[PDB]
Structure 1
């Protein structure tokens, strides 16, 4: 009237944070953690401390050949990836084609050193016109012009003698060399420009064995030209020579490019500003600081990125189901201001809440470990995802699509089920921990107290604060009080 009491219960708070489990939707929970990265800085950034190459209105092709309408950031000796607009305004001003263009973009996607040098001075053409090879298709300062890195040689007097030029790579580095051939409209234009009716370009390295022949066809006007310019490239190794021989139609190198190549990336399509930021994961929509194992921003990423997932939320439960003084069988304790599982007692020294420090710490460590495993076991590797295939490589582009879609399907399913399964394990863990605490006490107390059925015990003896501490410590001395207990019990 009334006997001392100890109750077992668990933390409750004012959290409205919701979680899903394999078995229940929308469970209110004490604390939760999202493992889905959803935020980007809306900028293009350095990748592992190397600037990108941003081409504002120029194709890689326009940029390499010196399309004179390309007004770009000129000096840039290395880069980590390339940014183009979807459809650049300035490509090949004089219409035509670039041989193995996509393989060259991929080779140039990431470059350790890039330095333009002069391999054949425009001034070295003594028996051909170096300054007439100009077109209204390729306008400069209002006046007719041409690609600036490459020379459109025309006949001098009414003669086009055979060109023989060798260039020996005396540099330490590989040379990217560019040249072209003019496909004229007819035999009259052919002889008007090059005098000789039948022409070739021969090009030889230790590797290359090329002979080009112009092709006449009747073609639609593009940039007001029915002629076509076709471009070719090789990499000249650092002690090899390249040998040019031509009768006509030769678009000669003036400038070539020293390159050092240490691994590739790809070409990103984006309309974003550079932002001086560093990042380890770039997206067409912005960069990401990628601690989280999953993201939903954009598939077309370059770097060490979270796995891309079709998903709005991946929220793990970290806390508990959230809902005399009665114990656990009737709900949680707002009063348990600290601790996850613990006790409420009332004796002649007064009443209050005490955390079970040991079971609380064990459980916090467990849940922290669960979250860190799900994050830290994720293998993160460098990859570069772009669209590098042309409109006659549609079968290969379909192969890439099935693979990308394939991985999106596997990761989206596994992350969703992983969160549902583990959330159910976590909430069941909390129930298992509370019930085990109740049993820890029930087994110490035996017949020295009575189970009240609500998660509380009423003692058959005086249990001061020091007795209570021994119950919470698991050091309760049953023999010490069996005598006093038995007297009140038999009555």
Structure 2
């Protein structure tokens, strides 16, 4: 009056953390983990400890040629990725085109070493006019000027003698060389400037075999010239030579560029500050330190990154559903300060809670392992997501978009369902575990005690603290009390 007791129960707490399973929405849970990265540092940072290349209002074109209003960061021998604005103000001062422009950007996205040199001195032009080739389309100190890396040759007295110049790459490294042809308005401008009326430029390497001829049209004024400049480029292998020849209309090299190229990258489209940080994932809205296997920031990322997923929350249940002294069948015990599953005894030496170290370790190690698998099994490659196509490559641009949207639709769907199914699995694990511990006890006692129905057993004998620890240890000796039990039963 009354007899000794032991109850099986589980942990609870004041946690309000909610989770979704394939079957139940908004399920309050004990503790849970988010696997979606949502947080960016709002800045552009190094990549594997290498600065970017941030063109403030210039453009790879304007930058290369020397657009005089491109007052930028001149000296910088290497970079990881490149950063243009949306529509950079300063591009081509004198209007025209850049042969294979995009393919060049892509090549310049990631440079190991980059040193500008001088292949044809501006002073070497003894029999042509080097310092007259100047326009009001390219203002400097309020005076007319021109691209500073490349020379507009004019006729001397009234003579454009044929130009023949070879240059030989005697550096250790490939050379990026740049020249151009002036397409003038009419045969007046043509001969006023180059005299000879039928001109041409031939350019030759061991690869190249060029022969450009000025085109005439009536064209609309752009920065007030109806003239057009069209530039070209080659890479000069490290012991080859380039040979120029020109009747006129020649925009000569002054400075070329030594490059060492080690794998690609891409141009990024951002309005952000450098932040002097490092990172391994750069986004056009900030960087990331991704432990997380998913993120939802911006799709146009560079580096080893989490998969981009259209979603706000991916939360994994790690703990339990969250809700005499009645056992598990009437809810969880707040008084289980430590341990996930365990007991509550009450005998003549007194009542306590007592955690199940063994079954609570398997449970934790299991859930820790689940969360870590879902993360460390994620194959993370270096990738650079850019927008590399002009507006006569809209078919190829549209093939790129189906691929990105296609991979988004797959990752966004499989992450959602993986959380929903693997949560339902985690909460049915917690149930299956509590109920297995009841039966661990129930099977040991048998008739030496009675199932009360609330998740406790009342004993048919004296169970002191030392008897309880045999029940929890799973070492309960029944023939040792089978008799004492038998008597208090029959009655």
TM-score interval, normalised by the smaller of the two chains = over 0.9
SS at match of 2:136: strand
Q: CA deviation at 1:96?
A: 0.2
Distance in 1 between the 2:462 and 2:147 partners?
Answer: 100
Distance in 1 between the 2:249 and 2:196 partners?
Answer: 10
Q: CA deviation at 1:379?
A: 0.0
Q: CA deviation at 1:15?
A: 0.2
SS at match of 1:145: coil
SS at match of 1:395: helix
Q: CA deviation at 1:65?
A: 0.3
Q: What residue ranges of structure 1 are gaps of 5+ in the alignment?
A: none
Deviations 1:93-136 (CA, angstroms, capped at 9, x unpaired) = 00000000000000000000000000000000000000000000
TM-score, with normalisation over the residues of structure 1?
A: 1.00
Distance in 2 between the 1:452 and 1:239 partners?
Answer: 94
Q: CA deviation at 1:394?
A: 0.1
Q: CA deviation at 1:232?
A: 0.1
Q: CA deviation at 1:438?
A: 0.3
Distance in 2 between the 1:198 and 1:241 partners?
Answer: 27
Runs of 4+ in 1 over 3 A off after TM superposition: none
| Aligned counterpart, 1:345 | 345
Deviations 1:337-384 (CA, angstroms, capped at 9, x unpaired) = 000000000000000100000000000000000000000000000000
Q: CA deviation at 1:233?
A: 0.2
Q: CA deviation at 1:468?
A: 0.3
Deviations 1:302-338 (CA, angstroms, capped at 9, x unpaired) = 0000000000000000000000100000000000000
Q: CA deviation at 1:33?
A: 0.1
Q: CA deviation at 1:24?
A: 0.4
Q: CA deviation at 1:187?
A: 0.3
Q: CA deviation at 1:422?
A: 0.2
SS at match of 1:103: helix
| Aligned counterpart, 1:395 | 395
Q: CA deviation at 1:417?
A: 0.2
- 1:71-470 matches, within 5 Å, as 71-470=71-470
Deviations 1:55-114 (CA, angstroms, capped at 9, x unpaired) = 000010000000000011111100000000010000000000000000000000000000
Distance in 2 between the 1:391 and 1:428 partners?
Answer: 55
SS at match of 1:257: strand
Q: CA deviation at 1:221?
A: 0.4
Q: CA deviation at 1:428?
A: 0.3
SS at match of 2:277: strand
SS at match of 1:415: helix
SS at match of 1:418: helix
Distance in 1 between the 2:74 and 2:347 partners?
Answer: 83
SS at match of 1:219: coil
Distance in 2 between the 1:448 and 1:225 partners?
Answer: 106
Distance in 1 between the 2:383 and 2:69 partners?
Answer: 34
Q: CA deviation at 1:273?
A: 0.2
Distance in 2 between the 1:205 and 1:464 partners?
Answer: 98
Distance in 2 between the 1:291 and 1:73 partners?
Answer: 34
Distance in 1 between the 2:2 and 2:443 partners?
Answer: 23
Q: CA deviation at 1:164?
A: 0.2
SS at match of 2:33: strand
Q: Does the alignment pair 1:24 with 2:30? A: no
Distance in 2 between the 1:356 and 1:71 partners?
Answer: 71
Distance in 2 between the 1:37 and 1:335 partners?
Answer: 35
Number of matched pairs: 491
Q: CA deviation at 1:398?
A: 0.2
Q: CA deviation at 1:250?
A: 0.3
Distance in 2 between the 1:352 and 1:156 partners?
Answer: 107
